[PDB]
């Protein structure tokens, strides 16, 4: 189905007023916060000039609130218009819930499996130390658990994890490195749990 615009076009009132190079920026952001799917939704409007939020609207409050003096005329102006405020409360319930129904199956429920590569390098300094890398790529959603196991037991110390990194194409990646001194007979296993997997992936080193 067709998604709905999450605002109605709203005009600001001119009212203070008035070397060569110059830059001017105007942003508007309309957010549906789904705190528990559509059982609890908070709708926000934000108006920005340059790097400052002038005024916002919270569906939980139901009126505009000026954050800086540049927004005080606009808040007072819009707040006196019952049609503006009624239109906005209709969007805040209708549009957020309508858009969620369309998006749910391919966003909230998007599921792309991680690929796992284990490899090892000697560290850049003595004493002799191995860096066991668990490289996890291509997954959605970004929430993932990536843990190192030594002889069936979870390793805590000397585990360094990068943040889950955004690829920008609806996939994510992460790198978890265990610094260790291997002994003969030692069994090192990277274990990856993710909503997209029926069972965890276990990839052992060499």
């Amino acid at each position: 189905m067709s998604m709905s615009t999450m605002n109605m076009p709203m005009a600001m009132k001119v009212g203070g007023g008035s070397g060569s190079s110059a830059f001017f920026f105007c942003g508007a952001i309309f957010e549906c916060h789904y705190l528990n799917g559509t059982e609890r939704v908070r709708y926000l409007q934000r108006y920005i000039y340059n790097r400052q939020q002038l005024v916002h609207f919270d569906s939980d409050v139901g009126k505009f609130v000026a954050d800086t003096p540049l927004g005080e005329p606009q808040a007072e102006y819009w707040n006196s218009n019952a049609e503006l405020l009624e239109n906005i409360m209709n969007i805040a319930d209708g549009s957020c819930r309508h858009n969620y129904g369309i998006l749910e199956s391919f966003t909230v429920q998007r599921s792309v499996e991680p690929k796992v590569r284990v490899s090892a390098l000697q560290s850049g300094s003595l004493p002799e130390t191995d860096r066991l890398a668990c490289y996890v790529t291509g997954f959605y959603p970004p929430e993932i658990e990536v843990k190192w196991f030594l002889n069936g037991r979870e390793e805590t110390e000397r585990v360094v994890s990068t943040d889950v990194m955004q690829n920008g194409d609806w996939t994510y990646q992460v790198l978890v490195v265990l610094e260790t001194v291997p002994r003969r007979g030692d069994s090192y296993v990277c274990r990856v749990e993710h909503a997209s997997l029926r069972q965890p992936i276990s990839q052992a080193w060499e």
């Binding site: 998604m3 615009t5 549906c32 916060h33 391919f106 690829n167 920008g168 609806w170 990646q173």
Partner: protein, 184 residues
């Protein structure tokens, strides 16, 4: 772990000396882009073309928001007495999409983050020479702190001894920010 945000984000901006105007209208879900509207062509462009099989968006709403947003920009310019803010320089990350193996195809990602205003072009080089085959540039993604970010993608097949660079020219800047990356 269970909250989600759908954002409709729009911006209207202009420079004097030199004179230039820009506009963007997009929907975003958590950190990712659903679509943006090509405002010239009244065309919805989905970030992954498969999203277009499940939903549609009429660009009419974006054309209306553009008109009013450009007028609101002039109102805020006059009410502020043309107040301006310092530019914030891009921070670059440069990483491959996948585990690198020599002579296997992959994608290098140049991520420009925490900059303002949202005007920045990426230039890719390989062994000092400009490369542009199959490059994709993202639109500008906002942050809660009112700074912006952008992605560029370079398809590559790595040879031993290759040196890749991404250079970001931010509006007004006397020179680009740059990062290099080498396979292995």
């Amino acid at each position: 772990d269970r909250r989600h945000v759908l954002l409709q984000a729009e911006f209207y901006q202009r420079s004097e000396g030199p004179d230039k105007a820009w506009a963007q209208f997009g929907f975003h879900f958590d950190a990712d882009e659903l679509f943006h509207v090509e405002l010239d062509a009244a065309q919805t462009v989905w970030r992954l073309p498969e999203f277009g099989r499940f939903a549609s968006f009429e660009a009419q709403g974006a054309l209306q928001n553009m008109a009013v947003g450009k007028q609101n920009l002039e109102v805020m310019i006059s009410n502020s007495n043309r107040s301006q803010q310092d530019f914030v320089t891009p921070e670059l990350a440069l990483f491959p999409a996948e585990a690198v193996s020599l002579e296997e195809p992959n994608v290098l990602i140049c991520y420009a983050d925490k900059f303002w205003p949202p005007v920045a072009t990426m230039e890719w080089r390989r062994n000092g020479a400009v490369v542009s085959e199959g490059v994709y540039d993202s639109v500008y993604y906002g942050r809660p702190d009112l700074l912006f970010r952008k992605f560029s993608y370079l398809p590559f097949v790595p040879q031993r001894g290759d040196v890749y660079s991404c250079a970001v020219r931010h509006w007004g800047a006397e020179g680009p920010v740059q990062r290099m990356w080498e396979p292995e």
